[model samples]
Target: ATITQDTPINQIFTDTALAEKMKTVLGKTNVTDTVSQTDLDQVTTLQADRLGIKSIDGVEYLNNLTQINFSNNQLTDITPLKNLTKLVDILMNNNQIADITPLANLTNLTGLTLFNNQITDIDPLKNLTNLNRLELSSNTISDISALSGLTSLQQLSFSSNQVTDLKPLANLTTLERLDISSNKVSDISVLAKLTNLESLIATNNQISDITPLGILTNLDELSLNGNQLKDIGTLASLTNLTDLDLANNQISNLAPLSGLTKLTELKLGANQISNISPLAGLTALTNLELNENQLEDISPISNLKNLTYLTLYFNNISDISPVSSLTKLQRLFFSNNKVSDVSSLANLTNINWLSAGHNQISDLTPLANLTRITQLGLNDQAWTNAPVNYKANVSIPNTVKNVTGALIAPATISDGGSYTEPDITWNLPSYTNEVSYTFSQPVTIGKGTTTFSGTVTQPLKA
Candidate 1:
């Protein structure tokens, strides 16, 4: 188990505290320079991050170690770790290491993060069957056929690489999260076999066909933006999805998205989608963007009572009566549309930012009622034609709109500490539609006193 401590190891560990710490862990006193085999056997974990290390030669003696982290260094050679079979985790990211052949026999590894390196071959990782998490992003690796045998992988990321094929990932049935974005992969038929996947992101790739993902019913989030996808009907069966991004694609038909009732956030901008009747059932949506689409009718999303932000810029929508019921809206974008009448927007008193410029809006009566609006974009022609009285409140600043009252309860003396009873208040503008309050702790609140008495309870002081 003899080893050699190369140039960088001797220079970086020259610090008195670090040198003493390493020697103490190895059960050595007054240790001068060379790290003996007995000294390495007494250690299990060694972390030497950001030490400007240029070499890693003494690691060969750590036969009993399980974890080692040498990230953020200047090392180029790591063959010293080849015989460290007892190693279980390796975190050597952000270095200049090109060859990983030393890791071939380290089969006990469960996690490996070698991002920001110069490695082009990963054949050494083929036999590391216990790997559950592997991240090789920002590297020079092109071939991943060596990873085909690592079946225990659950999370894998290979973004910003020269990967063009995905055939090697066909057998990884245990994968839960996979990110292969920024690659040159065009065919994804192999992804159909990965039914256990929960989140998949392959954005900015050469993919057009996503039929293989139709069987991934367990997915919660899927992003395929910046591709050439035109039809995504295959994703209709993924009902458990919560977030979906298909922006900058060629999709026109949205009938397939009708069944994804669990969607909370949906991005379909820069597409050719014209009809939105498929979105009528998605009432749980809180944020929806449909800009640069061919939407002439948006009545389908009128009943979305929970909508807080909605964007429909560059569309063909003319009627906005359905949007009048959406009183909870805060930010609304309707620029460059054919919205002639905006009387429906009068009920949206909660709107903070509203943009409705470049439209056919002739009447300015609805703009007067939105006193809460801070930033308003209206058509130039409509502002001049509106009555003088309607322009008065358009630029007015917002003021306090709610009245609240707090009723404090008196404190009662206890043994060592005083007990303060909970207070009851009312008359809030939003709480006026209030019902009642229920307490779980030991506190008695009066019905209409706007207050109550206290018990032997003191506010806990830390």
Candidate 2:
């Protein structure tokens, strides 16, 4: 029960291999750096890593530490931990700190990381309300308006500061993950009332109308990468999304992700999507990034059978043979489009990871079944610049499921992913069709896979 080793607690604690790796990661009666009254009785877990301590000064008897990591230090001032009160988790990231006003009486913290600081006032965290997860990345925050009374936050990161306006957090509503990327926001429509968000990264900022978010629903991961959106129906209210990054906005309708159906990673690279056939039906996509833009028929993603990471670099695609039924692809990036027969992915064979450099792909024998690909990015699409050839076959299972797992599986123009040009305009042409059902054809997805879809829509179609 005694400490302070800035070099010579017997030369790094008499190296009994650093006291048996701190008694196997803090388990020798809850290792302490400085303790008295019997090492502060019931210590739980505390490691002041790289302690050059300037703040958390003398441990005020942890009472029962939950988890505390004083990340790489030079220390500044945390006002001396006020009074532990069974603190939850706090990692004072790389320090040279600048006043955290003594943790404001701990308040049973949930998890707080103050990355690279110069703390420009957080109003002492509005009275240390039991936060959920807050990391103020690269500090110098521009008045977060006292965190709007926390309201049981759920994960907030203010990346690279100078935040302009976040509409005062618009009623937090138990956030899920909100990173104010870059900063200097431009009217985020008050985040449309959180609605239990899942992931919303406002990339780069200076937005241009996000259609006041139709209605959050339950996002999964949406990064409006680099602002200036070009209307995609304000994301159609984010229906239980998966991962959608509107890469470099100014996009031209891809039809607000029609049927959303719990998308599965879709980044619309560089906007102006020619017309991607309303992305077919989404079918729980699996990473489909349309690099650059001005794309030519990808045959609507061949019904996206759970595509496996496909990037169409540059654009104006030249027949990719409708992605060859996608049989769970791996990674195929056709650089600088206008491709020349990729042999329809030849029998796909569960591709590995191949990058067709600078398009106009010349036969590499349909990549010869991808030879269990390792890392091949054909430098410049053949014709020499060579050095990306490989071999390795068999192993394909991208991912796509929905036999009524409660929605989230659309996109099936038979698989190219989808686009029959329809951005929301239906006056005539809508149907329900005469329906009938009764099939047991040896059925049993535990007696499921019913496929009897008919949600009542007027019943009329040639």
Candidate 3:
């Protein structure tokens, strides 16, 4: 077949060369900004996924590339081009690559993702010392001994693999970000030597104790979501922590994180925590999630002025009066609590996302003046027929009803030019009186010429 310059440049080149030429065209334009001088001469940022017609191995063409996505394809073997020297990133997730041994010589690679594949042996990747990021999820690779040599790595993910032991990674002293979620790792004591670790996400593993991470002084983000860790005292020594996600853990007390002054985000959702007083002094907090705990009081967090996102759903909290002082708070969720008189939240003018449903709130009138609120939480129309769940265990002081009645009873009596009135005493009621009464009414004697009207006297309660 004859091909001209107008015959579509993709049809003239080889399969690997055509794929490489197509990658070069994608990097000429910036997706984020349309600036004319944003250095478009660099052919680095290119991403393509699953070009099923390309049968050639895609290693050599990816040598000078920065990003490549080949997900969900029929690729079985990719061992042809081991000369990917300048390759920095590649993603072949959800493909049919049986083993990643072809990438052993491509040690200059920084980011490599091969999730949901049939890869078994990762020993070939031991020499990839320059890798900054790696993902090996949904595979059968169990032995992590091959990772003992990677010292310059920073971010590593091995979620949903068959890895049972991580002791071999004790030599990885420079790792900062690591995610081993949904694996078979039970004890993480070997990772204690990695003192430069900044983030560790280990959710849904068989981990029961995490006492090893106490000495990791550089740790800032720690995620224990969906673990069986009941005691978390081991993290008390990591004082530089900023974000802590413990959702779905077995932790019951929050006393361990009292000294974490730099904490900005915390998620204790779906835990057994009952007390929240330990987080009262965390003034640097911005987001606090305490959903599905047994908390009864929210008064401790009243002074947290920097908090912007807060959730107390599914707790036993009845009073939202503490949140009135959180002026900088933007989002508040309080569903399924025992709260009533949500009208007391009238001071929360800046709050946006509100979900106070399924509570004992009777009036949402206090929130009527909140014009800056884009979201409002009110009782559903079906709540009108719903039985009131709030019962006054303690007596409610009837300030508006009982105090006026007490004042009228004392002012109806008067003393005149007859027998002097007796010194009668009236006890004050248990309510707040708005005004004190002074009784000076005239009292008629015989309805006739006996011009003697007693002067009434009212009393004030102090």
Candidate 4:
């Protein structure tokens, strides 16, 4: 263990200190300074993630290392790994490294992640044709032409970068999953040749035409949100799609999605869809969202009894009787519509949350049987000063011990009529607290006017 005058101190001190560092890094009982070289050959995997590892200066002693994870650190230099040609997987994400030229010699690498870094150039990875998975998200990479010849890639992500043209990916026909979201890509016609692709995400881009996507019939999950798609008819042939998100687009018709019976989750929010009758055949849908559209009638999905979640907010729907048969619905949102009668929801006994706010509802008698609804929203212009008879019909569960209601404008008498000595009945529940029925104007009664305000905690039992 003694070093001669001609021997470098690094060679003598590295073996013992490196073994101790590996012991601390690996948390194994057998990795001590006395550990033999025979034991090191079996140590192919070592992870020192988030250990304040700024340098791998002594890792050269472990030549057998194949997979190493040094992510979530402050590493700026990785020159110590230049000779480790046996490396197959290396995870160095969330670091401050700027130069990766040392990785050019590591041709055996098959999987690498360098996300969340300051590295600008990836030319060193041009020869890494064996790479199957590569992630360079949240970086300054604008040029990915070096990856054109990497035809072996199966999964690749370049999200949150400046990549625009994807012509280089035409040769990557073996790709299965690709993510290029938050980029400047406008044309994706180059991806039409990747017939094996199953999942593709191109959100927050300027893509307008999706005709190229029709050719990839093997796609199962696709997201083109925040794009300029006005027509999606080209995607009608993709019957294997299970999840499709085209939110924030200009789609006016959903006829293209009628044949996609395998869809389990579909998000078409913030679109211009007016008719969803085409979705009548998608009986496998479990989650459906058509919020922020111009839909007036949703009778199309009335028979989709398998639905568990449905949202139609910001539409012009008046009748929700179509959804009466959807007894499996756990959450229902029909807010900001023209709906007045919700009697059809009486049969939806499984609903946990119901938001019908911002509508013209005058009768809550239909909701009297919905005892399972834990949260009910009917607080808006028409619900504040509703007649005591209307509020009496709503039988909220006493399991809900507290109820809070607010009003923006002054309240007025819900019903307009004059009666001789008419007495307003109070149906306040026994668990009531902080109750107020303030009327901004006097209600005419038998040639006279009366203004009333009161708080009742006890139930009105005749």
Candidate 5:
């Protein structure tokens, strides 16, 4: 009972897992441990994350500690950290800490990360107004009115909680970034004048009206996906947005976003948008997604010359001739459409990943120079009564020294049906030890409806 700070830390430790961590930190042996207050004072920083630590009883010996990371542990209580007031930052993510009353007096702390905990109330943190950054995601807290006075907070994250009211964050106008995702927040009118915000991620909520967001024009990155928003007309004023995600909503009109020309990446999938003419002026777009919508005509986005990635899947698009102009495209996902003639894609040599499956395309010869293709999905899904490639094959003859190969289309024959196979390009593994291929007679193409599509009516062969 007379043990002092000069005693071995292992003698006072409760959990053996925490004692093992101290042995490594203090370079102590299990026999003659060189551990005392002198050894503990020299150690200020410890990145003891993912070490399966269950308790932090002996950590209070390091009173001179400035920063510590105990993330990914198994502790349910933090009562030992009350006396370590010199702590400036604490990273306790992915732990079972429920009560944080020990940190109530640490007003000198500037950063605290307590996400993935079991805390139900944050009343202890109401006095720590000097805190600048805080994270409390994935908790069961139902009320946050205690955080109304932390006006110095610059970044705050309270997502995945039961907090329904955000009136407490109105005074934190100095906030630059905020994330309130995966909550029951329906009305966000409390965030109207917090214009200092640069990034806001509030996805997976029940918010249907975003009228308060229009005033925060300083936001360059915003994600409002997984909500009940039916009209995005309020976002027209946020012209500074460069990355916007409005996916998985009830929105149909995109006219409000027509003026957001600075937008480089936009995700608007799973909506009721049928007309995309509003996006014609957004020529700066490099990545655009319009999948799972009611779109039919895609000529509006043809002018997006900087497009490197585009998704037009699960729509009723018939003519994709507009894509020929987007030569910079590398990935094109236009599946589940009515794309018949793909000859328009002949010039898109930069295409590496193309998925036009479940459509009415029969000719793949035009895709010859696309030797960089890593994933190609042209499977017709052939359920519809249209002329589609039920079974397509890429024939790369090893016996031929030619750099070009042949992409053979399906051979579905009708009465007096006829078609031709065209030459394609291939990425050869090697050309030094290659041979040639030459047959006697060519597969003759009869006269009628074309089962195979090509530019010329030449003989089809392997």
Candidate 6:
């Protein structure tokens, strides 16, 4: 027990949370009584995240502090950080910090992350032109006019904000990745000059016209999900796109996506599209989502042999016979449709999860070969707002193979036996194990009352 500090720098910190963090970093104990000043002055970096830290009061003693990460804490004010002008990197995500005026003078800061906070006015950051990486997502920021001159920004994520006009960011030509999703901005014409953009996510917005996006040829990942997009012909030239999400939109045409042969994942669910013939040429697609649409013929998807995951639920298509060729399919969700037979899926041995519920499926003979199945959802009742358990009159004979894992009892199951559960034993052999299933029956909230139930059991067999 020896004190070596000669400077006037010994104080008993009252903040217990800060005391413990500095104590652990300084290789000492009981710092709440008196911490050395020489140790604080030698430290140039500090990481006090998720330690329930309340204030930055004790941080003022660290003369050499350059980089700090206090993310996910209870910090409301950072006034003590204003004097630490040598700091370059600051991360403060998931905090209660409201007033960042303390960081206004930290001009040497090159990277700053302050997402999931109560920061509305970012005027304090206008002078921090050295910032290259800025993440300000999940905030109440409405006017981004403060970021007008911070042209050094290369990556910017301002999602989940209340901003409308993006014209303020038109000058940031150095931007490579930008996520402006969940906003009210309708026109993105100002972003036309940002040809350097490599990835742009603008989902759940009010954007309808995308004529300006065609110029950004460097874009490789573009997500425009849940937008007011009716025409996307402008995006056909983006051949560099590897993953495109246009789901939950008002698109009726897939002609614009035909040229995007580099795409491996394409999500077009919940759209007004009926004709998917335009997608036949995009053979590079591995995961395609065409759920909640009006289509009778899925023959166009037969050419996509590389597909491993495909969804065709909530549609008018009854003929999924074209899917027999997609032997690579691993997961298929085709619920709430008019399909009666899944004979086409028999060859897809890679399928581990196949949900064909709320359809007209009766015979379980086709799925006998799917020994790899882990979870199966083939019910007679539609689990929608109005669940109607329309019986399919299931009949599985002993000659049919056995189900190894989850066995969803088909409505009106008749295996050439009596009706009772004891007499209705399926005279079939069982397969291997290591499968889990939770059968939740649709609880029909009668125009007034409803009941939802579930069952978890082993494979049913003789």
Candidate whose TM-score is highest: 6
lDDT of 6: 0.77
- Name model 6 segments beyond 4 Å from true: 1-13, 381-462
Q: Worst ten-residue run, lDDT, model 5?
A: 441-450
**lDDT value, candidate 5, whole model:** 0.77
Residues 144-200 of candidate 2: C-alpha lDDT, one tens digit per residue = 988888888899898889988777788778988888888798888788898777788
Candidate 1: tens digits of C-alpha lDDT, residues 354-408: 8776665533455555666666665321211221122211111111010122222
RMSD of 6: 9.7
Cα lDDT tens digits, model 3, 201-228, are: 8988878888899788898998888888
Report the C-alpha lDDT of model 6 over 383-408, residue by residue, as the tens digit: 11112122222222211111332233
- Give per-residue lDDT, candidate 3, residue 403: 12
TM-score of each: 0.69, 0.32, 0.71, 0.77, 0.82, 0.82
Candidates 3 and 5 compared by lDDT, better number: 5
TM-score of 4: 0.77
Candidate lDDT scores, in order, read 0.73, 0.66, 0.67, 0.74, 0.77, 0.77
Screening candidate 6 with a backbone cut-off below 3 angstroms (N, C-alpha, C), the clashing residue pairs are 443-451, 445-450, 446-449
Model 5, range 231-278, lDDT digits (tens) per residue? Answer: 888889998999999999999988999999999999999999999999
Q: Write the per-residue lDDT of candidate 4 for residues 59-143, one digit (tens) a residue.
A: 6556789999989988888887888899999999999989999889898999999999887898999998999999999999999
Separate clash counts for every candidate: 3, 32, 2, 0, 2, 3
Model 5 error, position 9 (Å): 3.8
